[PDB]
Amino acid sequence: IEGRHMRVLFVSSPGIGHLFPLIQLAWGFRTAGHDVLIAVAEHADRAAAAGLEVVDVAPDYSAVKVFEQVAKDNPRFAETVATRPAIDLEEWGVQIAAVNRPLVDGTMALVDDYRPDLVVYEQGATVGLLAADRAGVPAVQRNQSAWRTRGMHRSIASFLTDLMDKHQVSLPEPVATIESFPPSLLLEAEPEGWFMRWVPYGGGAVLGDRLPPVPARPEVAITMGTIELQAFGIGAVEPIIAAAGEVDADFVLALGDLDISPLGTLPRNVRAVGWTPLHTLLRTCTAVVHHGGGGTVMTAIDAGIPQLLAPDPRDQFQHTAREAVSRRGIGLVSTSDKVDADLLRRLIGDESLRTAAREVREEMVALPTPAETVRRIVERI
Amino acid sequence: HMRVLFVSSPGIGHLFPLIQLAWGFRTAGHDVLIAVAEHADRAAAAGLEVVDVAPDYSAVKVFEQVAKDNPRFAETVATRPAIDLEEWGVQIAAVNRPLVDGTMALVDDYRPDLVVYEQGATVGLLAADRAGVPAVQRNQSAWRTRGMHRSIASFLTDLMDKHQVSLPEPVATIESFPPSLLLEAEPEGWFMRWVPYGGGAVLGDRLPPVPARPEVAITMGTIELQAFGIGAVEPIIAAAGEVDADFVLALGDLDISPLGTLPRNVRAVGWTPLHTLLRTCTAVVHHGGGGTVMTAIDAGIPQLLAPDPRDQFQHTAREAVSRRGIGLVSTSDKVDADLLRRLIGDESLRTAAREVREEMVALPTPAETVRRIVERIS
């Protein structure tokens, strides 16, 4: 009555936010009785800490090697396209291809061994499509954000012809693409776009010997993901904290397990917390300021609170989230360097933002769950 | 949309059988939190949010106190194979006792709509009563609940009075073993597919190689190995070395050397989840660790349940394997080559394992079971 047993292969290419949006679907297939395996090129430990079995298909993956490949393929990319904001993922085809290249041989061998009935791959992992073609099975894409796929896979695959030849693979189209963002957040559709409730996953955690306690007054969260902090430095969040110090409201600062001392003396209305999953933190928060890290927009939506997207102004991948948040009105958009007290008072006080966030939360939770989506994919294939 | 509290008391095999259900609730969009003590880290390594409700928990201090305060128990029941969980009530209560204050506190902070607790976690029932919400029990093995919880609770009167709770009964009890393995039913017993969970794992840069011909697994759990020593394996390995078959030795990531040079037909493999090992395997010898009997059934292969002779909690699993004919039963010190030959070659064992696999697979999945709980209970 629940139908045949399947083997599902999940494929995640290196990149910010790529892996975690796959986790609910992976658990979804596993709890529905199917075999699940994840293929990654970096941080396989992260996938195994979600209770999953993982193969690292690129033992010799490295950023340094990626950049060398890009130089061999487009000697001008580094000091042209790579140095400016991005409008379309396809423009980055040469670099995304260099990222996917080290995964190809290991993934083809894995497909041959594992014989999956289905490949689920995150949007930047064109190797997942190649793997599906190798196996002769359907591929389902998972989007993490507002970026449209358009013709990116053709462009990416154009840099992998040697490997496609070697492995006797052609580039197929996915049978479905699972959005992270609800319809009203997107102006343009994916072909075969499916919508699914966003159920936050930021890793397991021992929270302590008790739940993190409810503050007197709900707090405004100030947060930045670890890799963003690594890229841009703690300085990126400093003017946000300074601006928060000038607002009559209470703030909670969540910079992971980073030593926050180089921020100097925190304003007395800003209190630091150690790491917990963001959804856990936002349970007790009135609004959130973030840097557009992986899953942040949708986790703030799950919380039903207004957000301020304030990436470092040097962040090149924020165009489409900026547009989604502004167009729907669930939040405000700035860069971290331009956040001031007036902007934060608008985040906290403008009821329109909260109304929209609430409406979009209702829209999002009326979408099929990951458990329902698994059943719908199983039906589709 | 619900807040679901999972409750796992310390003890062998208690936690992992909750994981498929925890993930099932979360992928259905519900909030999920796990209350545990001892290796809260393992729960977190399943991608779950965890509260350690007794961070000072020490099994040794717990048992020491039980023996001090319960001389008749310590000189009779504590030293012999268990026949029933209720006979160990004083001990089970002592394991639950240090979890109570923190779990009560957590129920008051989290306010669950539902409690799911493993069979030994009577504190889960008390927590459900505090919250004024339904409790669902999860069984890991063949043990029947019977009157265990009233017995356990009778040692927790001071805490129940302090916390103003009484002992409720579960609204449903979710079995690990399929109907044909069980001689006696639970009240409100629900059957569910066994979907193996042994922890996440980085397998390496490829799947394990498929051997030329399927192998016989020889396995033992990491706690079992630490409880009993690697001497609980040597006699099996010696017997294997005399059999015309290929064997695969899987002792976790444990030092193999205290065994010395293996026989030429026995190969050591580093740790993978057991279900992943058995994908290749024609039969399995194990020591009755958590999930083993059902993971062998999921693999559809005959098994030899050969625990260390000092293992006190194998009575009910031995009877289940024997009665149904899905495997052979022994003790690790009594396994010989003839017994291994029977495990491999006796067609009835293989037929029974296939049939019980088909029975088990026809049961609702964890996904479906979560849907029925929400539908029928909550």
Please specify the SSE layout and strand pairing.
Two copies of one chain form a homodimer.
Chain A: E1 7-11, H1 23-31, E2 35-40, H2 44-48, E3 53-56, H3 63-73, H4 93-100, H5 104-114, E4 118-122, H6 126-135, E5 139-142, H7 152-157, H8 161-167, E6 176-179, E7 193-195, E8 205-208, E9 219-223, H9 226-232, H10 238-244, E10 251-254, E11 270-272, H11 278-282, E12 285-290, H12 296-303, E13 307-309, H13 319-328, E14 331-333, H14 341-349, H15 351-365, H16 370-380
Parallel strand pairs in A: 1-2, 1-4, 2-3, 4-5, 5-6, 6-7, 9-10, 9-12, 10-11, 12-13, 13-14
Helix pairs in contact in A: 1-16, 3-4, 5-6, 12-15
Give a verbal description of the structure.
It is classed as transferase. Keywords: Calicheamicin synthesis, glycosyltransferase, enediyne antibiotic, transferase. The assembly is dimeric. The entry is titled "Crystal structure of calG3 from Micromonospora echinospora determined in space group P2(1)". 2 copies of one chain form a homodimer. Chain A is an alpha/beta fold. Chain A folds into 2 domains: 1-207 and 366-381, Glycogen Phosphorylase B (Rossmann fold); 208-365, Glycogen Phosphorylase B (Rossmann fold, 3-Layer(aba) Sandwich). Chain A is built from 16 helices and 14 strands. In chain A, strands 3-2-1-4-5-6-7 form a 7-stranded parallel beta sheet, with helices on both faces. In chain A, helix 13 links the parallel strand 13 (307-309) and strand 14 (331-333). The interface between A and B is large, with 53 and 53 residues.
